[PDB]
Design a protein around this ligand. Structure first.
Ligand SMILES: Nc1ncnc2c1ncn2[C@@H]1O[C@H](COP(=O)(O)OP(=O)(O)NP(=O)(O)O)[C@@H](O)[C@H]1O
Ligand SMILES: Nc1ncnc2c1ncn2[C@@H]1O[C@H](COP(=O)(O)OP(=O)(O)NP(=O)(O)O)[C@@H](O)[C@H]1O
Ligand SMILES: Nc1ncnc2c1ncn2[C@@H]1O[C@H](COP(=O)(O)OP(=O)(O)NP(=O)(O)O)[C@@H](O)[C@H]1O
Ligand SMILES: [Mg+2]
Ligand SMILES: [Mg+2]
Ligand SMILES: [Mg+2]
Lengths: 315, 315, 315
DNA sequence: TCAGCCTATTCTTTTTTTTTATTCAATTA
DNA sequence: TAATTGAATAAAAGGGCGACGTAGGCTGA
């Protein structure tokens, strides 16, 4: 967590340093690793001083070629905030990945609001219990924010009641353009304090409910690539873990029985380029559920069980 | 629940208040739930005036991140009206909740419309007697409005019939779009008098008879999702309770394995992610039927038992 | 009961108003009962003028939001035709509520084709003796229409059957699509003269023979669903008691018990959800038949003995 | 011409078919 | 003297088994 108070040097004034705050660029990681075509069209920053803010951002955080052994250390330095389920820690090799896109499939009753509200108390746990010891936030868009589920699974982990009440924040995401106004604000709390998890269970559901296909046909598409350009900028900012429940379409293959999958879910191929690690969830018998990793040479294809019981997502 | 009679501040002219009204969004809650580019496509609106509506309405309603010890109270203000027999109410922890989506689905003669008529008398009850002291809004397309039942359950709770008849009102949608034609009625009446409940007793029955051509996103699915976000909108506009009713299909693929008669009710995944909770209907013996809850994030998957008696639901 | 001549105003063209009548829409309620896109799909129509109908269909008939009091005045304004038997009316609490689908399924020889003969006679009475005093319709797809049987009921009620033979009009179906076509001719007759009873006394006897099952079933069921939409709209325009005779299969599994003999009325769910007053017909001893009630919004699960005499239904 | 025709290459590896209701202490003497 | 049940059973295996079609679109036209 680093603000842009470092970026006040080399002839810069106090007026222009606020014009990076009001543009949405609240971190020093936002300045160097952004493409140049979005930074230059702001009214009131000239071309020579725009080349001044990129050259001071180059030497602090390096964009040059770094050793591949440092990348393997960048692969293993993940905190791996565990889901509470030890089978998934044997499936995803020790929990969720902080800073990589981790997508979970779901249609109905598969525990999607139950997995998000067990992880939302996990962010206070120490690193031996798996959690990252940090604040977090659950932004909901389907009107399914639960205090009772949040308060009960804290008793499973044995914490108090009032500390997790000061934990995960919530705002109702009304619109697809309201996904952006929280995102500039969610980086602004990242200036205020450290955060370790961000969860939205129905981010793609707003895409299902704003753009009446077709006629807009690209407007439903580029707003997904927009939203998947913002969150990876926060994922490259600190290394925050992302947890998104994505919905699934029932593909019509129902003649007869050969590879009959009501599948190939929504979001398109442009989330498929961004989802380096995908998961499939589905109903089993009773209330027990099953996870399988998809669309990932990073994680091996296997299956395990996570059981939504009265205590939480456990066994 | 606030109207646009207060937005007429800081240069907003009188033309854009009432043309926003008739076009479909009567409340400033709906303006925050309206998108950016959708406001531009109304004839009589420019792009510069489209900023002056959404930004100035953002001065009215706040959308910041609020901590988890405040929605615990925001859920606690829910009136959570009763269901007429406490075995369902203890299954539902008091009864159905306001500001959510609740669904009853079952085969036939199972009381999909009879659980409506007992909820239709609840809205004029006091808060000690479950009711939010308001009015309910009954919509049905099949023709299951039988107001002699509404005389009956008012005598179940003692109160007179005429004042109840001055209350809850009716509409019958003949078309899929005719639902959204009569949907504007909601807000319209809503701001004139506080309503406790909305009933659409045939959500997807009209959609069952107007498919796309072969199953596709058109009127069968997209206009269904256009419908449900407005049902989401009314849940977020006023917090008014609403019950929804989906018909049921059979399964022709499941040869005589574990259960020879499974159902999987219609609508696919678009209804399912808009679905907050469901309660499955199936008959027992005679007047005894059975409610089984489906897909609640806050309540377990338990089962209860009611009976359609002459006074209404009972035991 | 208002035709397209009540629509021919306001500079609306005379070339499209016959295209409605070519598409079966002979009255302004039907286009008000029709969704927007399908009328746009009609060839040779102006799209805006089609919308100009859709605001003037909204003007001519009440599609506006009303309160249950005037409904309860208008729902009391139903002719409520008696069924010839004294015991059957008090079972149904005053006979057959006009404007509704009342289904009568049973085995062979129970009286399904018998009662539909007697109902066509008792329409011609004045309303004091539970008559309707209107024309009535007979759609047969079995050939079991027998006008000699009507004259026996005519002598029972002191009415000259020669006068009753100038009314009820015969028709005969042969196909699935010859059936649904026969509504569109009949709709006109409903404009040009008052009716009370449109019987389809083997309405689902024909869909079983002309579609196999497990494949070509969805082509049956959707087309069965396309049938009832035209059928419910005939009830609501002209105020006509709609009587459907369903046949019945025998269910074949370990559900074989007594007094249910498990029958499972054919037509799945789409013939079930379109019930207002679903019946059931068992044979007792001899001519004493036993009419159990299913699936009705206002009636209890009772039964009433009735004997099919030499002169119609008797007691 | 489209509409009937033609069946272009594909492509990736693993999940769950019952029950007549006694034990006991009984839920009441 | 309470006495009927709130509770609980399983390794064998049935009076059971069957789906639309727009996707490469030649030739007839
Ligand atoms: N009090 C409770 N006790 C036990 N289990 C519970 C309780 N409340 C909820 N559950 C479980 O929560 C599960 C709900 O799964 P879930 O997939 O989160 O539903 P959902 O996500 O809210 N539906 P949706 O809004 O469409 O995402 C149920 O299957 C229950 O087993
Ligand atoms: N006076 C009454 N006494 C007892 N039961 C009644 C009485 N009136 C109606 N019922 C029952 O109420 C139920 C009404 O049917 P219901 O199941 O609500 O409609 P439904 O599920 O929508 N089927 P459908 O109306 O065709 O779509 C039936 O089970 C009737 O037996
Ligand atoms: N003149 C009569 N006197 C007495 N009973 C009669 C007379 N004519 C017919 N019936 C009875 O009417 C009943 C006809 O049964 P009904 O159920 O109407 O026919 P149905 O079953 O529909 N024929 P089907 O199409 O094969 O089902 C029989 O039980 C006859 O005994
Ligand atoms: Mg869930
Ligand atoms: Mg019902
Ligand atoms: Mg008969």
């Amino acid at each position: 967590p680093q603000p842009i108070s470092r970026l006040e040097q080399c002839g810069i004034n106090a007026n222009d340093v606020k014009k990076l705050e009001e543009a949405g660029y609240h971190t020093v990681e936002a300045v160097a690793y952004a493409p140049k075509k979005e930074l230059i069209n702001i009214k009131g920053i000239s071309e020579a001083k725009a080349d001044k803010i990129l050259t001071e951002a180059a030497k602090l955080v390096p964009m040059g070629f770094t050793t591949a052994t440092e990348f393997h250390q960048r692969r293993s330095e993940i905190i791996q905030i565990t889901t509470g389920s030890k089978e998934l820690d044997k499936l995803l090799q020790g929990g969720i990945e902080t800073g990589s896109i981790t997508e979970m499939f779901g249609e109905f009753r598969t525990g999607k609001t139950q997995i998000c509200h067990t992880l939302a108390v996990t962010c206070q746990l120490p690193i031996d219990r798996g959690g990252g010891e940090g604040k977090a936030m659950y932004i909901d868009t389907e009107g399914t924010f639960r205090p009772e589920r949040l308060l009960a699974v804290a008793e499973r982990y044995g914490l108090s009641g009032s500390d997790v009440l000061d934990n995960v924040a919530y705002a109702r995401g009304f619109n697809t353009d309201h996904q952006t106004q929280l995102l500039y604000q969610a980086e602004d709390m990242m200036v205020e304090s450290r955060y370790a998890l961000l969860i939205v269970d129905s981010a793609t559901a707003l895409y299902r409910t704003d753009y009446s296909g077709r006629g807009e046909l690209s407007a439903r598409q580029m707003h997904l690539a927009r939203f998947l350009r913002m969150l990876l900028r926060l994922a490259d900012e600190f290394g925050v873990a992302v947890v998104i429940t994505n919905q699934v379409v029932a593909q019509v293959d129902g003649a007869a029985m050969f590879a009959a999958d009501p599948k190939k879910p929504i979001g398109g191929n442009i989330i498929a380029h961004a989802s380096t690690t995908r998961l499939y969830l589905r109903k089993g018998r009773g209330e027990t559920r099953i996870c399988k990793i998809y669309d990932s040479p990073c994680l091996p294809e296997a299956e395990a069980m996570f059981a939504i019981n009265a205590d939480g997502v456990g066994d």
